[model samples]
Target: ATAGTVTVNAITSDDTIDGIELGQTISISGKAVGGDISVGDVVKMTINNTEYSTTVKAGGIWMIAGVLGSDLAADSEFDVVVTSSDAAGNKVQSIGTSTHSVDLSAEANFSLAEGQQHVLTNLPEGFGFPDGTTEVVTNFGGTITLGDDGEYRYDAPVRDHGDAVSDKDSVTVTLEDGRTFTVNLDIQDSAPVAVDDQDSIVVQHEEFEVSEIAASWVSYTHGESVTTFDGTSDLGGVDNDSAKDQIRWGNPAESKQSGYGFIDNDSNLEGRFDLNQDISVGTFTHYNYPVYSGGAITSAEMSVEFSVLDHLGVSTPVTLTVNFDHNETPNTNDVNASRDIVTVQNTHVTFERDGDIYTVQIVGFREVGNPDGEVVTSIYTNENAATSYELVVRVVEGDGYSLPSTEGNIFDDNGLGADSLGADGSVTVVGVAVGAIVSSNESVGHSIEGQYGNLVLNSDGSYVYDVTASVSDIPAGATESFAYLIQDQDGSTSSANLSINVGTNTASTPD
Candidate 1:
């Protein structure tokens, strides 16, 4: 017989193969008497800790898909187990597993957004789910519903091109007990880029906007201007004076400086601060210069006005010696104070009207930080609340230059105190629509309880405030947290601190 090229065909083992060293492929090779050596008829190994049966094709050629526990540990020993089928029944045998000392521990995190196509990005090379492997959420012990199209989904925009004004669209994942866990999938998009000829910068202002669903409060910065007594001054006062008043628009006496500036009067119009010198801290008596009779309020109605005082105690005397109109009529007019009532602490004098009525009791003139008489302020307001109006007043000084004055205002949530309440044991809560009501008292300072005030996600999967630390009220300061319910239709609410050091990559699965 001529010497033919012979290859180790395959090893068909009855039991599981174990501890076979890596990089070694053993096969039964030799010219068969009547049968030819095939590809899959070789030996195979089961890739699980629990014993299971496996089969080979025609040839005795079998390769291990993955070594059990081999993907993680290096230099770890694993058993090469195999199973086969025959005339009697399925039988299992161990030939032993080849010890795999290789390491590929760079698997990436799998993330999917709410309603968008569940596309995975930033995936590391060499790692992926096997083909024909379907996506199914298990171990959740809850109802997992994908998008309507049998995929992920996203809600459409309410107003065209408008930032999302509603709560984000959510995927309703329900449990067996009817509890709902609505998961809000993130919507990823390219940020706004400002194009300069060659290089471009992307603006990262894109965010989940719930402005319409809840009120959004943002602070804008402004420069503080201290006017010194200048002898030769473009500013109306005298030269090199001691009273260097640090003021914003409508400067009120003794009122701490909060944010003071201008905003767009109309959405579609070119909004601006028509008057700069008008901004300052002051008691707003006459908001809009003159009361419009059937005539409409002008564009200047949206100016800033600081609170001089809350309505309380004996009505402090305010001397309104300033003469000038806040009206946009383009002419000097007499605008008088509407009402002057003592609000909170009585230190807060509400100057409702603007006019010569203040001139009647114009007694002593004292300025702050001065040995002069009591500092008198005359506020001008036509009504208690003026959605549109301005109190253009003229300041009286030792000199003749008139200082134009303006006022400020604010709008907060009025819906919270009236909302419905929901409670479960230690968590008795009044449900507040997001952004429905923000802190009205800006001076309300809040302090958190040390460990007790620490937040924790409640059972039923809702986010809750643990209040780990007892909070102290800080006047003019604020504190808040993301609120969630214990149980909804989708999932139970649970929470953990959104730590910066340990982000989404550090989620803990409690056994």
Candidate 2:
């Protein structure tokens, strides 16, 4: 008859799981055949003929944790059979097989950068995979590889800087039972961007030297520019009164300080202190009632430093010290009793030479006592402060020595006024050399030396390059390789190479 049968005690409630659920362990239990089945007996459960083996339990029962193949789909029918071993090792099977259907439908969407890979694991609660299933296939032949820990991965393809202009790409997850889902993937662009423009110049100065132009002196004046006036009558005097003009070498209008003194014996100028002897600098005769009712008499012990340069540019140093004095006896009743009187000293001239030109600097100041410290002036406690005065000196054409022709505004005539020659000033003479500027150009690449012009672009995807080609030292009938490259403002570059042939014989002829 029909072999012994195992009575199914009961079937667990989760015969079918929610959509997209796979590999869920389901349990099935049944009563042994006539108490013939006991522990250590084999129990088998099959889904669609795929068998999973387990063992019988105590109390004449057989049970097992059942599993369905991953390829099975939701809402699809599959036959299940449970079997067990009875006493005497007789095979006992259950009655007509039970049927179950899995219900599943799920979707997953992902966006990834080009060449970036995404791992899928810990899927949504209802969307899970069967245990031991390591991979899934897409309808487009794309495969999603899964790890033992249920991690799914897909690598997005690399794309250009922007999104694909036409069709995009996608993938579909498919189960063997005809159940399928779609996953749309987006790939992004990743490329380096170009840079901007700036100043890029190549300068070559081999044949000639470059030097900054000399414009050192801020301003200058001459002693002849000093105006004189009579203090007793409040009347304006000659521009160059004999005594007042004594400090100057030439006309009262010349601008250079070199025009301020003697040229003979390298001696004192017509109105200057002799190099070997001491002399007193002259005065200003202007006076006011509250100031010097008569006239403020002032004098200076002159000192000089002479420096010279021959026809060849060379310099020698000269040093000296000059003391100036102003004698004024303040009236006791005069409001000036407590105030310190001030006066100007001589132009302590120091001369320097550069090339054929000469530079002269004059330093002087006002002080409380005379040069000998003999005069006991008012306000002995007053500070010995310095004062500035302007005067021009020149070498008269008397001795064998003659001055060079003076250029530049250093000699410009400004009327003999205090504005032109004041305190605190300096002078400089420079020997400027003249030369020619030479330059050459060449293409950028393949050549070690040459200047290349920058390339500019047009809106129409067109560009132009400034190119200069130069060649030197070519043997007769020799062919030289030359290459040129052009890079546009956008960083795109193009280049070409060629050869030039030099004629065996060099000749100049008219046809």
Candidate 3:
């Protein structure tokens, strides 16, 4: 037998729902009035197979108030059935029931970003109206215009800011079916987004030691070029044999690792170098050397995690594996490795007591053995060959952000984002679920530039602020707010403040 059903035309903002008419009856509103009534009969309103039950209350004045209304979709409707069960073991089905028409086919709600404008189209179709004919009675922020196509438009307003200083804001209107929709157009911020808590560094004289130029080369060097040693990789070898991913101290785990050392301090490279610091994974290890010497190029081997993944403001703490392979050539074996030594993402050079001073120049978003192919072959410091190396990057692994789908993965192309390399760095990413960035705000110059240290920030979002201004300059319980306007991967931008609470300064007691 078919189950008895009583459908709601449209759910509303009504609080009291009682007196559902029974015996083949319908309700624009209700009471458990008729239909084979009993004292303790349990009554239920089933919609979407989910049951909302209430015992036929004292005097059979049955009621079930707004259940999921705060979350109910406006443009959607649900089919509801009123079923009755008795106090004993027997079940009684719907008797005299009436039906109402609410087409549940069309869309129920609309969503837009905080700083966006949503044009709601196609007026709701269905439902021949009743006493209260479709008068817009709520959320007056919207303005609707009659269109030439006989279609209507609701010009929804833009939400002010992404931050939730206020409660959620959305629109509502009374539809032709005498029902009020909670969502006319809903506005919300998409998040797990970046907040600008710019937090720090001081350059005072500490005992800085000098080591080999090979260490920092690990992180900063491009093409995985390791300047050959005084051996075949260096000044005095009979044959230009295996020039590997060579490091001076041979192993990264040596007491005296020979790569990155203080240059401007120890080597007195004060004037020549403009690049700040070098980067490395472990010490650059000699993975393998294929050909025998006399070879301008030597070790053409590969290794994983050769370079440490430099998590920038753009990239994240990933299973972001960075790997590189390139041929090694001797320093004494002399071929001006670099075509020209101009500037590369800010460049610096240091003289090595021994060659094999590998420097890591990260060409962002690359395809392995694929990113333009030249960076792997032309192991040079004065590089002009691999144009993709500049502002280039690759997705080795996306923690949960993406598939291992490497963007700069196009074979022999400028290591991805080659369009102005999309302004060279990362845009503030909102959702980690989306890793594919079409391009970013490079032209408009979304950036932060501060020289002095009052706060410090890291690739990871942790920060520290040293508030040391005396009471004359500032008072207790004051907050040092860092205001910044951050942008989404798209054009959506918003202003926010990182308010650091300067708590009370209590004097220390003697121990």
Question: Each candidate's TM vs. the true structure?
Answer: 0.18, 0.23, 0.21
Against the correct fold, how does model 3 do in TM-score? 0.21
| Candidate 3 structure quality by residue, lDDT tens digits, 1-511 | 2223332333433322211211112223334545455555556654434566664555545455645422232213343334565445355565323233332223346555443334455444432223434333225355444345544345444443434344244444444433543444555544223333321222111111223222122232333233433233232222222322333322222132222111111133221211112112121222222222232222222222212212131211111123333333333433364232222131222222122122323332222223233223222332112222222322111122221111111111222221111111233422111112222233212223221114332222233444323222334435545443334433453433344444333331226
Model 2 stretches with alpha carbons more than 4 Å out: 1-103, 126-142, 148-150, 159-168, 175-181, 195-200, 205-453, 456-511
Summing lDDT over every window of 10 consecutive residues in candidate 3, give the lowest-scoring window: 403-412
Lowest lDDT sum, 10 consecutive residues, model 1, at 206-215
Say which candidate scores most in TM-score.
Answer: 2
User: In terms of lDDT, which candidate is strongest?
Assistant: 2
What Cα-based lDDT does every candidate model obtain?
0.25, 0.34, 0.31
How far out, in Å, is residue 51 in model 3? 35
Scored by lDDT, model 1 comes in at 0.25
lDDT of 2 at 44: 57
Residue 142 of model 3, lDDT score: 54
Q: How large an RMSD does model 1 have? A: 26.6
Q: Which segments of model 1 are wrong by more than 4 Å?
A: 1-109, 113-116, 120-135, 140-511
